């Protein structure tokens, strides 16, 4: 029985980056070649593995994380990166092995008027640890004055929205991203490729 990659890439709904998703894939056969050979991804790099070897490999688990960011934020998904998305929304670790896959969703996630359902976290008292996920809505105290939470004031709401319009530059267009994470523990493997 084949793996549910289609459930991950073709999901009609994809999360907001601050509330990114994670599906655990196990006990199936993965023909990764359906992914790396696809001309439709705008971005496709594996780290610590050469994409050739994926179909000849066997992992204990595979973890698909999925979200939507804007075009010029995609350079931040990769490990060792900093900036808004890496510091406050989604952070890969430095020892990361796995692939980062992206593709422009402007036809899917843009609406005439702007699609505001996609949000990102603008402020945080400290950086995320790798793979931490933060869905707080507490009011950020950027300033020395204590905030009573109820009000904005000089304190700020933490989540800001992407204004996703079709006519935006390619930098400010939605990009669905999937991050595969390959875990090899000293347990019998459960996700292999067709050649393995």
């Amino acid at each position: 029985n084949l793996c549910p990659f289609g459930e991950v890439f073709n999901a009609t709904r994809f999360a907001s980056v601050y509330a990114w998703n994670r599906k655990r894939i196990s006990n199936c056969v993965a023909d990764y070649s359906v992914l790396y050979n696809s001309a439709s991804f705008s971005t496709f790099k594996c780290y610590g593995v050469s994409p050739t070897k994926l179909n000849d490999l066997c992992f204990t688990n595979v973890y698909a994380d999925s979200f939507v960011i804007r075009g010029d934020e995609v350079r931040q998904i990769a490990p060792g990166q900093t900036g808004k998305i890496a510091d406050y929304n989604y952070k890969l670790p430095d020892d990361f092995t796995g692939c980062v896959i992206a593709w422009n969703s402007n036809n899917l996630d843009s609406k005439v008027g702007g699609n505001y359902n996609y949000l990102y976290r603008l402020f945080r008292k400290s950086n995320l640890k790798p793979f931490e996920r933060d869905i707080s809505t507490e009011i950020y105290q950027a300033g020395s004055t204590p905030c009573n939470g109820v009000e904005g004031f000089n304190c700020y709401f933490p989540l800001q929205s992407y204004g996703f319009q079709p006519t935006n530059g390619v930098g400010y267009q939605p990009y669905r991203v999937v991050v595969l994470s390959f875990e090899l523990l000293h347990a019998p493997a459960t996700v292999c490729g067709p050649g393995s």
Partner: antibody
Amino acid sequence: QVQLQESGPRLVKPSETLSLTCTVSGGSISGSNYFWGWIRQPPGKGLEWIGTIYYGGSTYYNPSLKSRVTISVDTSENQFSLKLSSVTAADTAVYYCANLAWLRGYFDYWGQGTLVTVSS
Amino acid sequence: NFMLTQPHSVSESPGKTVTISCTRSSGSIASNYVQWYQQRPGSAPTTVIYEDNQRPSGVPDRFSGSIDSSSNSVSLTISGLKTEDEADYYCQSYDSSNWVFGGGTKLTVLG
């Protein structure tokens, strides 16, 4: 261990159709999942991708040549072909065939190259 | 579509170090893998670096690769320059449904 060999006429008249073939030893075009491309370079000038093909069915062409290029493959003789219609003095080049192990890979195994000159 | 741009030539003495730049015209050079070919006159080009930082079996470790997204360039670098390294070098990538070669660069080991 795959070997590639360009074959075809090294002199084409202007306005005619240029036709090359890349016979492949050591691997099976259909049995492999490699990509198979054509790359050319005019003398004294840099390389220029022409087109790649994949035996699954999808074929990719340089958009500056799309109307003039077609690329085919027949398994019976294990080779793939280049055809460049409406040729002019500007298509004089060394033509190379190369393979690729995955879309977005590197061109691993190359032919020696064949020079075609275009002149009546 | 995009272009890759390299210098026309670089030159340095044997044993020194030389770097060759490859700059994408548009899009992020970091989007997809970038490769480096050495071309000796009369031969088909050889892969020296693939996936930006990798050397194929055979290529010595004097050849290294590096990304610099701040300038949208990648760089091939040869230290311990040796006269046999005198050749033409091309970078290549793939975005959209096109593969692109750089202009090429004529390295010269100085004699």
